[PDB]
Design a protein around this nucleic acid. Structure first.
Ligand SMILES: Nc1ccn([C@@H]2O[C@H](COP(=O)(O)OP(=O)(O)OP(=O)(O)O)[C@@H](O)[C@H]2O)c(=O)n1
Ligand SMILES: Nc1ccn([C@@H]2O[C@H](COP(=O)(O)OP(=O)(O)OP(=O)(O)O)[C@@H](O)[C@H]2O)c(=O)n1
Ligand code: NA
Ligand code: NA
Lengths: 215, 219
DNA sequence: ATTACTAATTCACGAGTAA
DNA sequence: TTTACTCGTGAATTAGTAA
């Protein structure tokens, strides 16, 4: 489905919507009209686009899952060709229930954070709600593999594999952690051996910049 | 796209070396296909110039060619363009002298008119040759995947002159352009044009190492 | 115009196997 | 073990249409 999503995004230009016909997509791809029509139907069925289709053609909306196909390909090639592509994300500090402390305190995560990232972290995650204008940079980071943290099973629940990226928030070293199975939210989570709210005097609502190292 | 996927996987296995020791069934496992299909893909990649091989009863040594890498860098450049990810380039290399033929090519009226309209310059008649350092060859390949500024080719009673792509560039803070044929030629020599005579503008001697910044978007 | 169904066709895939 | 051939099968694609 990669080539068709690539061409729909190219047609969508700046935005993530394109007004197209199956014939236009077909000739963009070097395939028959009938195949392009089928490809559009399958992309919608599998959640890569949403669409409105009439006898006047189609409005195709690339979803976050559709875009992730392209950003994942870009990250694959960046990694395989050793092309540097670090990222800056800006967002705002938020608070929650204490979910991050529950996760980070798991013994099976802690051992891996030390073995793979070299830290014993503060038990928690600093949540950052990414600004709308930084969403393309969030999509780019989510494309990359980062440092693999193996998931595990306990008696109460199952914990998925996560990926870690070396990062800096106001020049404080830290790591962005996200599930390897991507879920499209605007919230990123940061761990560090420093308690970041104290280290850099953060409050809910403060805007911060996070540099993320994808290599 | 199946060739793209196979080239990508072979490069993934090869990493920086551009060489991967593989059996066809090992590549098949990597691609999720049959041993036979992978052996057929390997032969077709060879037939089409994407790899060269040493083949024995033990396995294969698969060498990705410049053309094979161009497939991957062209796909990278496509995504960089479509996703609007800024991916300019810094090249290092050494100044060389040639046979003095760049002067002839740049002086073709049909190019000159396009250099003036599209690049805003009447070039000095010649090209500054830079032999790119071995360490900068991956970045040279990155540049070649991008489209640059299209310069249309043309026909005379003599010969055909091929289309050219130009990239805005800077050499030691001097604005210039890198120009290369659109029908990609896998050479380690890049060619710079400018309205300035660069030998005098920045006292360039043969063998001098220089850094060239090449803009693959905008500019 | 279109979309997109069904049927024809083709050509890609992998089984079997020789060397 | 390999590489890599032939060839039967069917999944993928296109053509012919209907709406
Ligand atoms: N390296 C870290 C990790 C966490 N925190 C902060 O420490 C607290 C505890 O983290 P957590 O348990 O994750 O709390 P919340 O983020 O509020 O909860 P949630 O994950 O539910 O959003 C939070 O105030 C969080 O911002 C921090 O300052 N530095
Ligand atoms: N903007 C430019 C263009 C070219 N040159 C120099 O102008 C001379 C003539 O260029 P050219 O005819 O292209 O000669 P070579 O580069 O030596 O020959 P060739 O292109 O065949 O390799 C060369 O010394 C070249 O380095 C320069 O300094 N400034
Ligand atoms: Na948290
Ligand atoms: Na020259």
């Amino acid at each position: 489905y990669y080539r068709a999503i690539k061409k729909i995004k190219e047609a969508a230009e700046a935005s993530n919507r394109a007004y197209l016909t199956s014939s236009k997509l077909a000739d963009m791809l070097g395939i028959s009209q009938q195949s392009a029509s089928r490809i559009i139907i399958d992309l919608e069925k599998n959640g890569y686009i949403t669409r409105t289709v009439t006898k006047r053609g189609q409005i195709l909306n690339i979803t976050e899952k559709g875009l992730d196909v392209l950003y994942t390909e870009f990250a694959d090639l960046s990694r395989i060709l050793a092309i540097k592509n670090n990222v800056v994300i800006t967002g705002t500090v938020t608070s929650g229930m204490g979910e991050g402390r529950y996760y980070v305190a798991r013994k099976q995560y802690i051992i891996q954070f030390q073995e793979k990232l070299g830290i014993i972290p503060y038990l928690g995650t600093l949540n950052i709600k990414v600004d709308q204008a930084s969403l393309p940079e969030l999509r780019k980071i989510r494309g990359f593999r980062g440092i693999h943290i193996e998931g595990f099973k306990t008696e109460d629940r199952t914990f998925g594999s996560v990926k870690a990226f070396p990062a800096k928030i106001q020049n404080i070293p830290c790591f962005v952690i996200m599930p390897e199975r991507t879920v499209y939210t605007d919230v990123i989570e940061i761990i560090s051996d420093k308690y970041l709210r104290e280290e850099i005097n953060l409050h809910d609502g403060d805007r911060v910049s996070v540099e993320v190292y994808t290599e």
